[PDB]
Design an enzyme around this catalytic site. Structure first.
Site, PDB file in Angstrom:
ATOM      1  N   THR B  73       0.800  -1.227   0.000  1.00 26.08           N
ATOM      2  CA  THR B  73       0.000   0.000   0.000  1.00 26.08           C
ATOM      3  C   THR B  73       0.832   1.277   0.000  1.00 26.08           C
ATOM      4  OG1 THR B  73      -1.723  -1.196   1.178  1.00 26.08           O
ATOM      5  CG2 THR B  73      -1.890   1.213   1.245  1.00 26.08           C
ATOM      6  N   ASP B 170     -19.022   7.355   5.580  1.00 27.08           N
ATOM      7  CA  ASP B 170     -18.120   7.454   4.442  1.00 27.08           C
ATOM      8  C   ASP B 170     -18.839   8.307   3.381  1.00 27.08           C
ATOM      9  OD1 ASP B 170     -16.888   6.727   1.773  1.00 27.08           O
ATOM     10  OD2 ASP B 170     -15.522   5.606   3.096  1.00 27.08           O
ATOM     11  N   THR B 202      -9.795   5.269   6.486  1.00 28.68           N
ATOM     12  CA  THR B 202      -9.889   6.299   5.456  1.00 28.68           C
ATOM     13  C   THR B 202      -8.499   6.552   4.864  1.00 28.68           C
ATOM     14  OG1 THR B 202      -9.373   8.231   6.885  1.00 28.68           O
ATOM     15  CG2 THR B 202     -11.689   7.515   6.857  1.00 28.68           C
ATOM     16  N   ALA B 230      -4.923   2.425  10.085  1.00 30.00           N
ATOM     17  CA  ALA B 230      -5.007   2.998   8.744  1.00 30.00           C
ATOM     18  C   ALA B 230      -3.757   3.830   8.392  1.00 30.00           C
ATOM     19  CB  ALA B 230      -6.281   3.818   8.599  1.00 30.00           C
ATOM     20  N   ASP B 255      -1.264   1.082  15.126  1.00 29.05           N
ATOM     21  CA  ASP B 255      -0.331   0.354  14.265  1.00 29.05           C
ATOM     22  C   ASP B 255       0.500   1.352  13.484  1.00 29.05           C
ATOM     23  OD1 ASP B 255       0.610  -2.179  13.154  1.00 29.05           O
ATOM     24  OD2 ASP B 255      -0.246  -1.484  11.248  1.00 29.05           O
ATOM     25  N   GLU B 260       7.443   7.276  11.778  1.00 25.89           N
ATOM     26  CA  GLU B 260       7.727   5.853  11.936  1.00 25.89           C
ATOM     27  C   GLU B 260       9.219   5.484  11.742  1.00 25.89           C
ATOM     28  OE1 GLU B 260       4.884   3.602   9.599  1.00 25.89           O
ATOM     29  OE2 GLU B 260       3.191   4.417  10.750  1.00 25.89           O
ATOM     30  N   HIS B 278       3.774  -0.993  12.717  1.00 27.67           N
ATOM     31  CA  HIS B 278       3.158  -0.973  11.366  1.00 27.67           C
ATOM     32  C   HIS B 278       3.081  -2.377  10.733  1.00 27.67           C
ATOM     33  CE1 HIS B 278       2.525   1.629   7.487  1.00 27.67           C
ATOM     34  NE2 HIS B 278       1.519   0.776   7.683  1.00 27.67           N
ATOM     35  N   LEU B 279       2.396  -3.267  11.433  1.00 26.61           N
ATOM     36  CA  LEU B 279       2.225  -4.680  11.085  1.00 26.61           C
ATOM     37  C   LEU B 279       0.972  -5.010  10.277  1.00 26.61           C
ATOM     38  CD1 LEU B 279       3.364  -6.488  14.402  1.00 26.61           C
ATOM     39  CD2 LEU B 279       4.769  -6.021  12.370  1.00 26.61           C
ATOM     40  N   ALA B 281       0.094  -4.985   7.152  1.00 27.20           N
ATOM     41  CA  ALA B 281       0.304  -5.781   5.950  1.00 27.20           C
ATOM     42  C   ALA B 281       1.305  -6.914   6.217  1.00 27.20           C
ATOM     43  CB  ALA B 281       0.834  -4.872   4.852  1.00 27.20           C
TER      44      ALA B 281
END
Ligand SMILES: C[C@@H](NC(=O)c1cc(-c2ccccc2)nn1C)c1ccc(C(=O)NS(C)(=O)=O)cc1
Ligand SMILES: C[C@@H](NC(=O)c1cc(-c2ccccc2)nn1C)c1ccc(C(=O)NS(C)(=O)=O)cc1
Lengths: 301, 302
Positions: B73, B170, B202, B230, B255, B260, B278-279, B281
């Protein structure tokens, strides 16, 4: 049969259901031996949670006592031997804790796949360890559920929403009943090699002691993940440690231990082990449902 | 397009699909600026994860480069300006990560409800502090979902199985369409006072930077729990810390961060905060799908 004493922190619904059933009830909390004995003198029933200790001296002094009801699953604060000598029935409320126990089990499964508790400890240590905490998707994996009563059933329908294939076994629950909640029953011998995850939801009995042992862990697919949110002893702790040591078991999530608290720390200290101090029933909602269930049971007889 | 360099660790399925498409593949990792530039001299394509930095100097030195693919992503590691300037197409694979991101989100929700990372830490410290813990049953609780794309939808259907009431908002997804997957859309102002739990799914935009801030935190019910799996910054970090310190927010699961790894440790260190590096994915399955997705895109280009 006629008068009941509630001697612990209980939801007001308990008093309401007892009175609606035609029973007189006294509500008091954190009493001493003598205070407890005095109140019990004209009571056929006694309702406790965790605070009141129903010892031999209390039992023997309550000559009219017929039923001791514990709002919860475990009966450690009640002298079972003294009650049985006096002909007193000891009751619990296993249904009230079902939802909170099933929810914790599902949370444990998600924790085994992504190592959220270990990743949190790492982050709190100032580390940023991405490669180490590379996990697995639940979608498409097989969950073996041993014990298909209320808890096993609730775990199955939640994990089915994650796309997990739910299989299992229970000698009491029919394959027709389990099929109605999407669980295919297979002979126990056939379950072990198919599972990516195994969870136990049985009572602790001679037949369920060491259900997961050296022989059954060896029949498992290499890297199986195990959950025990039922009772300490269903998973053989020494066999679980050997399976984690070899890598036959990729991780374990334990809410219960053969000894509580466990004096042998080898499992708790293992990096692939997630644990809680018996928190399965530890929600305000479960406590209220147990208060309600115990009153429903007392009325029924 | 004839030769592709995969400069980060990818699933063997990526190389295998590219070769099935008739492309020559070179697989290397942990390359320096000089090493990366040299490998790209005869490459028309480059596939990266997040470690390879596709800087202006890399783009300008790779004269045969036509396409840069990210197996995952976004494109924070790729200089989008330099790529646009040199006519280089930039591709990613957001759909490959959706299930893993939604699964982590559900895990975060369960971790906040039962304080599992805290209970594990307590046990590992040799303590039996059962009396210090009191969890919350998810059944009948309201979960607010802000952003109802693929990830928001997957989170909703899983949490519906726990008997959670799933509401959300949304601007792109109609209330009729969200109703078909059990999410009741209401005006944003009506959502805040109803939620026991809030999760954000989002994109990071001017409208979503600090979506949860001091104003919207005050609108929440006392004891709300918040999840951000997100993008760092959708939840205002400063506002979240004040809400945690006041008790307005009972707990948060993060996350992602504005920086970071985060150099500001106030949130991570908070007793009511659970976190991951940041796990979202980070599964063998998501990595395999992204590698597959980017290879199919490169083969579709030839
Ligand atoms: C439905 C019934 N099943 C059984 O009794 C049962 C299952 C097994 C078994 C053996 C080997 C492999 C797989 C299953 N053997 N037996 C005797 C049951 C009863 C109570 C609980 C309960 O949770 N109790 S509780 C709240 O007090 O912990 C749960 C289930
Ligand atoms: C469905 C669509 N929604 C939107 O774009 C959107 C939502 C909001 C909003 C603002 C305030 C409060 C609540 C929602 N505003 N907008 C413009 C969407 C698209 C992509 C992702 C995505 O996550 N992509 S990814 C995998 O590449 O990261 C996610 C969602």
């Amino acid at each position: 049969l006629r008068k009941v004493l509630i001697s612990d922190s209980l939801d007001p619904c308990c008093r309401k259901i007892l009175q609606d059933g035609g029973l007189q009830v006294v509500e008091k909390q954190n009493l001493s031996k003598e205070e407890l004995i005095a109140e019990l003198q004209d009571c056929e029933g006694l309702i406790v949670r965790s605070a009141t200790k129903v010892t031999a001296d209390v039992i023997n002094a309550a000559e009219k006592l017929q039923v001791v009801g514990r709002a919860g699953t475990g009966v450690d604060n009640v002298d079972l031997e003294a009650a049985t000598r006096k002909g007193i029935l000891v009751m619990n409320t296993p249904n009230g804790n079902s939802l909170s126990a099933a929810e914790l089990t599902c949370g444990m499964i998600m924790c085994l796949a992504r190592q959220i508790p270990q990743a949190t400890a790492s982050m709190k240590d100032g580390k940023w360890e991405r490669k180490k905490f590379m996990g697995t998707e639940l979608n498409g994996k097989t969950l073996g559920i041993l014990g298909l009563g209320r808890i096993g059933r609730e775990v199955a329908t939640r994990m089915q929403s994650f796309g997990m294939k739910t299989i299992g076994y229970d000698p009491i629950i029919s394959p027709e009943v389990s099929a109605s909640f999407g669980v295919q029953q297979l002979p126990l011998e056939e379950i072990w090699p198919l599972c990516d995850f195994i969870t136990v939801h049985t009572p602790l009995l001679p037949s369920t002691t060491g259900l997961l042992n050296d022989n059954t862990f060896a029949q498992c697919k290499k890297g199986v993940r195990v959950v025990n949110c039922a009772r300490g002893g269903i998973v053989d702790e020494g066999a679980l440690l050997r399976a984690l040591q070899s890598g036959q078991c990729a991780g374990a999530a334990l809410d219960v231990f053969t000894e509580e608290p466990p004096r042998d720390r080898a499992l708790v200290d293992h990096e692939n082990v997630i644990s809680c101090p018996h928190l399965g029933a530890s929600t305000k909602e479960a406590q209220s449902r147990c208060g309600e269930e115990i009153a429903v049971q007392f009325v029924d007889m």
